[PDB]
């Protein structure tokens, strides 16, 4: 309420050059960057990014039709999610060849204790191998369905984004 | 702006040689300590920006030994230059002989 | 008294720790089992979209308009 943290940067020592402004941390609803996997410190893969997958798949129903090859055509208005699954499955590899900037082999995880856990030092290396890779079970499971759920249903549009 | 007939390619390959030449140029005229400096000022930008924050990369992006930055000047070039005349000397003759 | 916030922004997400999760799932994942669905992954469409006629093409047949493979000469 009384002005705010303006000039004097990034929280702490006026010399740690990430940066503070709005579109860092703000009333107008930074809130975003904090319920999709974004910030928080959060919890437990799958139900973080099976959301990405879920969302991320159908997001491509676009440049998979009027863009590219056949606009509107035979075989046909299978548009929405063609090989659009097909031309995931590497997006569904890629980050399953990432597994090198995450390593451990198991996921406790999950609560937290008292005490605390997500212990007072997160920004960085909590996540693991058999510690991240089940987010990968999400996005892919989520990808498909993220694709496929846009197919079976609908295709002479409707009021879906109006805003929002 | 009609079609392609059977001499279609170098009509592509050629402009290839006529691209793939060309850009054996940046590497060449555009020397070394302009790349790092820059490729820092955003090797950096993508180290801040959330959502695509949890992504720290296995090793660490630098610009190119000045040799190289003269080599791949040479195998975009010549490759370009081996190209075209290459496709021309052939193109040419399947029309005229 | 507490000027709030977030800070602590909105309910810790839905009673949804279940079904997606676990269930199905291609999962466990990497190292071993990854290839396990990127082997089909890349020999799937491929393989089976390195055929299926007969057919589906761009389309054209029976070389004529003043015959062809001739003239005329013969069959």
């Amino acid at each position: 309420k009384p002005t705010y943290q303006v000039i004097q940067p990034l929280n702490g020592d006026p010399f740690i050059g990430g940066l503070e402004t709005p579109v860092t941390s703000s009333p107008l609803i930074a809130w975003y960057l904090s319920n999709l996997p974004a910030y928080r410190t959060a919890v437990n893969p799958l139900l973080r990014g099976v959301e990405v997958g879920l969302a991320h798949g159908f997001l491509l129903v676009g440049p998979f039709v009027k863009a590219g090859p056949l606009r509107n055509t035979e075989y046909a208005g299978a548009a929405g999610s063609l090989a659009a699954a097909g031309l995931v499955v590497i997006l569904s590899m890629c980050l399953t060849m990432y597994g090198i900037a995450s390593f451990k082999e198991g996921e406790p995880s999950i609560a937290p204790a008292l005490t605390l856990t997500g212990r007072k030092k997160q920004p960085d290396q909590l996540q693991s191998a058999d510690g991240w890779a089940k987010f990968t079970g999400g996005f892919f499971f989520g990808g498909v369905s993220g694709v496929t759920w846009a197919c079976f249903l609908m295709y002479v549009l409707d009021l879906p984004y109006y805003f929002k | 702006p009609l079609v392609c007939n059977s001499l279609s390619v170098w009509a592509w390959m050629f402009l290839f040689g006529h691209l793939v030449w060309a850009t054996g140029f940046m590497f060449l005229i555009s020397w070394r300590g302009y790349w790092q400096e820059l490729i820092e000022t955003l090797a950096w930008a993508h180290e801040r920006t959330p959502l695509a924050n949890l992504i720290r990369w296995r090793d660490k992006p630098v610009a190119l030994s000045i040799v190289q930055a003269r080599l791949v000047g040479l195998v975009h070039f010549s490759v370009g230059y081996i190209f075209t005349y290459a496709a021309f000397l052939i193109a040419s003759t399947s029309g005229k002989f | 008294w507490d000027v709030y916030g977030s800070d602590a922004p909105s309910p810790y997400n839905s009673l949804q720790s279940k079904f997606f999760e676990t269930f199905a799932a291609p999962f466990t994942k990497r190292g071993l089992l990854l290839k396990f669905l990127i082997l089909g992954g890349g020999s799937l469409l491929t393989y089976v979209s390195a055929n299926a006629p007969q057919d589906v093409l761009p389309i054209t047949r029976g070389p004529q308009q003043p015959p062809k493979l001739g003239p005329r000469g013969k069959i």
Partner: peptide, 30 residues
């Protein structure tokens, strides 16, 4: 039965190198 050899090309371009840039991804983490 018959029609192909496409079998090869979706490899030699599509999965094969998909597996080159895959397993020597590497050379590093070979």
């Amino acid at each position: 039965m018959i029609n192909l050899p496409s079998l090869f090309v979706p490899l030699v371009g599509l999965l094969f190198p998909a597996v080159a840039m895959a397993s020597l991804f590497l050379h590093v983490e070979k």
